[PDB]
Amino acid sequence: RKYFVAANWKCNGTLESIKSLTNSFNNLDFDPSKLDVVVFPVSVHYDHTRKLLQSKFSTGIQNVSKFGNGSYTGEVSAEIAKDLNIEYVIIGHYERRKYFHETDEDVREKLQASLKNNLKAVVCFGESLEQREQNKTIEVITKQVKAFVDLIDNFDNVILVYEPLWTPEQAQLVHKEIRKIVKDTCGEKQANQIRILYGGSVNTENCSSLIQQEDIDGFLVGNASLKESFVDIIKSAM
Amino acid sequence: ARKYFVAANWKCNGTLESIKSLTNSFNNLDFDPSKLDVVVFPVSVHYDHTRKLLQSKFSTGIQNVSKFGNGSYTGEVSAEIAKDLNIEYVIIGHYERRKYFHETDEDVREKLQASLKNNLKAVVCFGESLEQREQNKTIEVITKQVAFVDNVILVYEPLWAIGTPEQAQLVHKEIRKIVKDTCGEKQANQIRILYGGSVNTENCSSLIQQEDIDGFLVGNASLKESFVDIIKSAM
């Protein structure tokens, strides 16, 4: 299984800060065969970011429309992304489920539109604090994953992200179960090749312990990916 | 009056190729920049491409803006980021975002505050449903909506629709009155109020000639080279 480390810059950045950060990233002698590294800038920063980063870094956007082209003011379709050669998309991030009421079905529709237009999807799911307290971790993850599981294609174009809102051993236990759910629809071969990332507040402390777990294959990193020390997180999976 | 204002809302449409062809034709249009503003609103990821291709006689903007500032708001574009990119305009409150993406009057207030806080110009869409209109409640609806009042371009989107010139004019007159009542006559007679229903080459001139219609927010017709003829109709 090829590891996978992604920078979710969220809603952060200026033209100047991206110049400096991409420079630091380029200075890392990173091995693109041992792992995929994807940077997800703000939509309006994508061109700027793609131009500044070395080709070895992959790039993507933080959301994509559930609709094709047409009268959907403010949306970015998968066909537009395809035409721009945007390689990856984040789908179903907790913040979009929370603030913008995105549903499991929106996530399904976004995934289908992405895959059919030859995009690679980074699909997020995860349980809340209360849900974990009530022992609903796998209940919630199973619901969220089964919503789109039958559209899961292959290791190249579907990367899963478990982002709990709350040990590495306990994360591993969840990851193994996620892989089982994927296996029940996609088979051993695909389930063994598909990457399942940890996306629950990843940093330069926990990346070492998490990445060495059997069923944790990389990270979707938030604030820690706006730092120069993001390179250390890349290094942990390299 | 007023300096007119004609905007292209491309919505979720375009390829890099189609935009090259379209911008090339737009650039050939000689228009009097004293008589009107022209603004093109491409998809977010097309912004730099479109800004690069379009000559500087055209303004540019984005079709939506975040209700939050910078931070952990995956997928959003803040007014602060737009300012740093020198993005001049933002569309706020378009019906499609109300219809498909849960946006309310409160969301519109937040987006407006954010935009103005960062010296962006806001193109603010509002309008009454068929159900409010049939009750003869348009005045009541547009009064409340016009919530935001307390730089800014107003757009009447007749949700009822959804989308005559006389129907549009009546509402535009009333919106102007609401601004006059709160902000004074000097401001109310300076502010642009665009018609944002269906605009095309067949109805643009009948609409633009109405006393209180100062331009258009143009949808599907703005994806066509003949958009230049709609700009021309306002000269």
What features would you describe in this structure?
The structure is a homodimer. Chain A contains ten helices and eight strands. The first copy, chain A, is globular. Chain A has a single domain (1-238), classed as TIM Barrel. In chain A, helix 1 links the parallel strand 1 (3-8) and strand 2 (35-40). Helix content of chain A is 42%, strand content 16%. With 238 residues, chain A is an alpha/beta fold. In chain A, strands 7-6-5-4-3-2-1-8 form an eight-stranded parallel β-sheet. In chain A, helix 7 (137-146) runs parallel beside helix 8 (168-193). Chain A: The active site is at 93 (electrophile), 163 (proton acceptor). Chain A: One of its GO terms (molecular function) is identical protein binding.
Overview in brief:
The structure is a homodimer. The first copy, chain A, has 238 residues and is an alpha/beta fold.
What topology does this entry show?
The structure is a homodimer.
Chain A: E1 3-8, H1 15-27, E2 35-40, H2 46-52, E3 58-61, H3 78-83, E4 88-91, H4 94-99, H5 104-116, E5 120-125, H6 129-133, H7 137-146, E6 158-162, H8 168-193, E7 196-198, H9 206-211, E8 218-221, H10 230-236
Parallel strand pairs in A: 1-2, 1-8, 2-3, 3-4, 4-5, 5-6, 6-7
Helix pairs in contact in A: 7-8
PDB class: isomerase
Keywords: TIM barrels, isomerase
Assembly: dimeric
